[PDB]
Amino acid sequence: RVVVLSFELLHAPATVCGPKKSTNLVKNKCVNFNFNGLTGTGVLTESNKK
Amino acid sequence: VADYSVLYNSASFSTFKCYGVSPTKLNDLCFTNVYADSFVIRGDEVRQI
Amino acid sequence: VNQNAQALNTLVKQLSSNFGAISSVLNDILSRLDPPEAEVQIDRLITGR
């Protein structure tokens, strides 16, 4: 019996990642962020963008 | 993430031929859709996959 | 000034092209492949950039 998993990478959100969940937000600082499967490094600030 | 609790990927079965990373390492990779396809083949058809 | 703006603009937009790789962002390749299969594709991407 052969079981293969076909994967497609899209923009839909993923709600479950790893054993750790919250990792409480820290703003106005340079941090490594992973949000909705998007991994990057940058400063997290508030803006007025709607 | 599919399931991190039950992992048989380590030396639990007869034959393991894997590419990339094992199911243990899939916990850090986020993908959208998962289609699990189940089918039965013969002995000589394993090399054709 | 338009040639300088267009030169910086072309210089940034070429970063988004994959140049024969899976994706232009290194996090998608590093978050999937192991370092040994990954070194051929990252070296092709760096050589293109």
From Swiss-Prot, chain A:
Domain of life: Viruses
Annotated stretches, region: Disordered: 11-33
Subunit structure as annotated in this protein's UniProt entry: Binds to host ACE2. RBD also interacts with the N-linked glycan on 'Asn-90' of ACE2. Cleavage of S generates a polybasic C-terminal sequence on S1 that binds to host Neuropilin-1 (NRP1) and Neuropilin-2 (NRP2) receptors. Interacts with host integrin alpha-5/beta-1 (ITGA5:ITGB1) and with ACE2 in complex with integrin alpha-5/beta-1 (ITGA5:ITGB1). May interact via cytoplasmic c-terminus with M protein. May interact (via N-terminus) with host bilirubin and biliverdin, thereby preventing antibody binding to the SARS-CoV-2 spike NTD via an allosteric mechanism.
Function: Attaches the virion to the cell membrane by interacting with host receptor, initiating the infection. The major receptor is host ACE2. When S2/S2' has been cleaved, binding to the receptor triggers direct fusion at the cell membrane. When S2/S2' has not been cleaved, binding to the receptor results in internalization of the virus by endocytosis using host TFRC and GRM2 and leading to fusion of the virion membrane with the host endosomal membrane. Alternatively, may use NRP1/NRP2 and integrin as entry receptors.
Name of the protein: Spike protein S1
Primary gene name: S
UniProtKB/Swiss-Prot annotation, chain B:
Consequence of changing residue 7 to I: In strain: Omicron/XBB.1.5, Omicron/EG.5.1
Annotated segments matching region Integrin-binding motif: 42-44
Effect of residue 15 to A: In strain: Omicron/BA.2, Omicron/BA.2.12.1, Omicron/BA.4, Omicron/BA.5, Omicron/BQ.1.1, Omicron/XBB.1.5, Omicron/EG.5.1
Function comment: Attaches the virion to the cell membrane by interacting with host receptor, initiating the infection. The major receptor is host ACE2. When S2/S2' has been cleaved, binding to the receptor triggers direct fusion at the cell membrane. When S2/S2' has not been cleaved, binding to the receptor results in internalization of the virus by endocytosis using host TFRC and GRM2 and leading to fusion of the virion membrane with the host endosomal membrane. Alternatively, may use NRP1/NRP2 and integrin as entry receptors.
Subunit structure: Binds to host ACE2. RBD also interacts with the N-linked glycan on 'Asn-90' of ACE2. Cleavage of S generates a polybasic C-terminal sequence on S1 that binds to host Neuropilin-1 (NRP1) and Neuropilin-2 (NRP2) receptors. Interacts with host integrin alpha-5/beta-1 (ITGA5:ITGB1) and with ACE2 in complex with integrin alpha-5/beta-1 (ITGA5:ITGB1). May interact via cytoplasmic c-terminus with M protein. May interact (via N-terminus) with host bilirubin and biliverdin, thereby preventing antibody binding to the SARS-CoV-2 spike NTD via an allosteric mechanism.
Protein name: Spike protein S1
Natural source organism: Severe acute respiratory syndrome coronavirus 2 (2019-nCoV)
Lineage of the organism: Viruses, Riboviria, Orthornavirae, Pisuviricota, Pisoniviricetes
Gene: S
Residue numbers of the full-length protein present here: 362 to 410 of 1273
